[PDB]
Paper text:
Members of the [name]-related [name] (GNAT) family are found in all domains of life and are involved in processes ranging from protein synthesis and gene expression to detoxification and virulence. Despite their sequence and structural diversity, all acetyltransferases function by transferring an acetyl group from the cosubstrate acetyl-coenzyme A (Ac-CoA) to the amino group of a specific substrate; the substrates can be very diverse across the enzymes, ranging from small metabolites such as amino acids to secondary metabolites such as antibiotics. Interestingly, a representative of such guanidine riboswitch-associated GNATs, a GNAT from [name] curia (LcGNAT), performs acetyl­ation of the arginine antimetabolite canavanine (or δ-oxa-arginine) but not of arginine itself. Hence, it has been suggested that LcGNAT serves a similar biological purpose as CtdAs, namely prevention of the misincorporation of canavanine into the bacterial proteome, as acetylation makes canavanine unusable for protein synthesis by the ribosome.
The crystal form obtained in this study contains two molecular copies in the asymmetric unit, which are essentially identical (r.m.s.d. of 0.73 Å for all 174 Cα atoms). Thus, we conclude that LcGNAT is likely to be monomeric in its biologically relevant state. The LcGNAT fold approximates, but does not exactly follow, the canonical topology of the GNAT enzyme family: β0–β1–α1–α2–β2–β3–β4–α3–β5–α4–β6. Instead, LcGNAT consists of seven β-strands and four α-helices with composition β1–α1–α2–β2–β3–β4–α3–β5–α4–β6–β7, therefore lacking an N-terminal β0 strand and including a C-terminal β7 strand. The sequence of the P-loop is highly conserved in GNATs, hosting a consensus motif (R/Q-X-X-G-X-A/G; Favrot et al., 2016; Burckhardt & Escalante-Semerena, 2020). Interestingly, the P-loop of LcGNAT is degenerated, as is also often the case in polyamine acetyltransferases. Here, we mutated Tyr97 in LcGNAT to the similarly sized, but catalytically inert, phenylalanine. The Y97F LcGNAT variant also showed a significantly decreased catalytic activity.
Author numbering: -2 to 171
């Protein structure tokens, strides 16, 4: 096609099947390098169940976004505010809970566009900081967030099957 620009969309319940599919695909791709598929499966079978993501799609303090590259789905983003945050960071905070780019679109600026939009949304929502959890072994993501001015401010355990994983908490104030 002739569409070089990326386009953003807010997901609705008719995107559920597509959301489930990309959520699983990108999660496995991210964690399979250093986690067993058996452990990834147990995380997926609870977090990305269709009924589970349906309720999250109905949470008005959360929002899912799809990003398209020449009319093909290239990644997705989930943000939380208020009581939808996975940690109680308070009324002035804005969580990026999920931010993923499909493999075939990596290294083409899709992730930077998603995060740039996430920060725009936080500003419009009058929030004072953006925060997120990043696996301590996902050094590429760490460097990605660091170029946006995120800084490690703590940690948080992340259970994947029977294996305890450790997320960094990274924060960008503004």
């Amino acid at each position: 096609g002739h569409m070089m620009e990326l386009s953003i969309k807010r997901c609705d319940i008719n995107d559920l099947d597509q959301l489930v599919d990309i959520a699983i695909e990108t999660f496995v791709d991210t964690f399979l390098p250093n986690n067993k598929q058996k452990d990834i499966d147990q995380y997926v079978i609870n977090a990305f169940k269709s009924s589970k993501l349906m309720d999250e799609l109905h949470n008005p303090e959360s929002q899912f976004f799809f990003i398209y590259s020449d009319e093909e789905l290239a990644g997705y983003l989930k943000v939380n505010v208020g009581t939808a945050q996975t940690e109680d960071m308070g009324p002035d905070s804005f969580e990026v809970q999920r931010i993923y780019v499909r493999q075939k679109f990596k290294r083409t600026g899709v992730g930077t566009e998603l995060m740039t939009r996430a920060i725009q949304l936080a500003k419009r929502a009058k929030k004072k900081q953006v925060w997120l959890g990043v696996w301590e072994k996902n050094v590429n993501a760490q460097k990605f967030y660091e170029k946006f001015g995120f800084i490690k401010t703590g940690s948080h355990k992340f259970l994947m099957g029977s294996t305890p994983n450790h997320d960094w908490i990274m924060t960008k104030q503004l």
